[PDB]
Ligand SMILES: Nc1ncnc2c1ncn2[C@@H]1O[C@H](COP(=O)(O)OP(=O)(O)OP(=O)(O)O)[C@@H](O)[C@H]1O
């Protein structure tokens with residue numbers, strides 16, 4: 354019986370795999386590389402950056418270049434998954450509020466270019482909620498360039514209450530680079546930025562009380578950690594460990610006028626029918642690579658508890674596998690015995706065209 | 716998305732229980748209603764008859780303490796699907812082992828029981 358594929362098109366990292374698997378088989382940079390002075394995709398393009406000019410066709414979860422996106426999909430099928438796409442139903446993910454035109458284009462490419470026998474598009478945040486075993490909750494999805502707050506009720510996102518913070522992982526990596534300079538350290542090249550990324554992913558944490566945490570770092574060397582660069586050198590990180598992710602809660606750190614993620618979540622909740630707000634507060638699901646900082650759930654709990662009436666039960670759900678929550682959610686959905694009905698078939702595409710996506714995929 | 720079991724769902728007042736088994740919705744033998752494997756996930760539809768002739772629905776997806784992600788994820792999705800199939804008339808309820816609602820617990824006359832075990836993950 355047919356094997357479906359699942360592709361989660363992240364702005365920075367693409368995750369691809371087979372429905373039924375508990376993890377994506379392939380995770381690689383969403384980059385297309387072309388001769389600086391054919392093409393490459395993923396790790397290889399990143400490696401050969403010395404002779405290639407790199408492009409990221411996905412910005413804030415939205416596709417900005419369709420020729421490059423096609424290259425990425427072609428590569429995903431033939432190289433990463435080693436399948437013939439015309440032999441597999443394909444489930445693709447999209448950002449919340451993906452423009453109508455983009456949904457039709459993704460649909461058109463799959464059927465016309467790749468000749469997929471069937472296809473489906475699901476909202477990333479909804480797949481994450483499903484993966485957590487819930488039909489109601491508010492998802493805080495933070496990856497590469499944006500953090501989305503998506504309220505969902507009984508299986509469906511509430512578009513009117515979906516909000517977003519234009520700040521995510523790449524911005525935090527950028528920030529760590531900058532604050533590490535004030536200490537003396539200089540990381541400006543690509544391989545150097547990868548080191549800063551590694552530092553963020555391995556030593557950073559969200560402090561429960563920032564002001565108290567800074568006082569602690571200032572009056573003691575207790576919060577300091579040592580990092581060994583690949584070039585033998587061992588550097589020392591201090592309050593940068595928590596100042597970096599603090600930007601999610603205090604976007605002013607990056608000179609942004611926007612409200613931190615805790616307020617965005619609260620604001621999204623306040624835009625929904627008062628009758629369902631209790632269920633959102635009690636089911637705040639975090640997903641995405643940028644929610645992986647230790648301490649983020651405790652901090653989200655504290656901030657949300659502070660904004661909501663003291664009667665409100667606040668529950669933050671932060672599964673250890675939250676970096677792949679969207680993909681896992683798609684793997685489950687695509688594996689259901691009822692999925693064969695939900696997808697858009699070639700037959701349907703042939704008869705109705707791209708616009709069929711607005712009637713078959715919410 | 717009409718599944719064979721969906722065709723049977725909510726036809727008359729009463730209780731219907733299905734267990735998630737390898738990405739599919741499988742009916743539980745009526746003689747086993749109330750005996751929940753803690754390593755599994757289930758979907759329970761409670762149909763109540765209304766004066767007008769139509770029925771009232773409450774969909775509860777029960778999650779055992781040891782059920783795998785695919786099972787709890789599927790129970791939630793099947794619950795959204797059943798509701799959609801029933802024209803969106805069902806109130807959905809997440810029921811976690813050891814924390815079920817008074818309503819849900821009340822569907823079992825002699826009280827529900829927990830038993831270790833269940834069907835293997837579908838992953
Ligand atoms: N342990 C970690 N701690 C902090 N950040 C992490 C960790 N692991 C990964 N990240 C960060 O998460 C980001 C990538 O996240 P993710 O894979 O969810 O994004 P994406 O799919 O590419 O983005 P988007 O969903 O916005 O399209 C990067 O900035 C990366 O450094």
Ligand SMILES: [Ca+2]
Nearest residue numbers: 754755833834
């Ligand atoms: Ca089981």
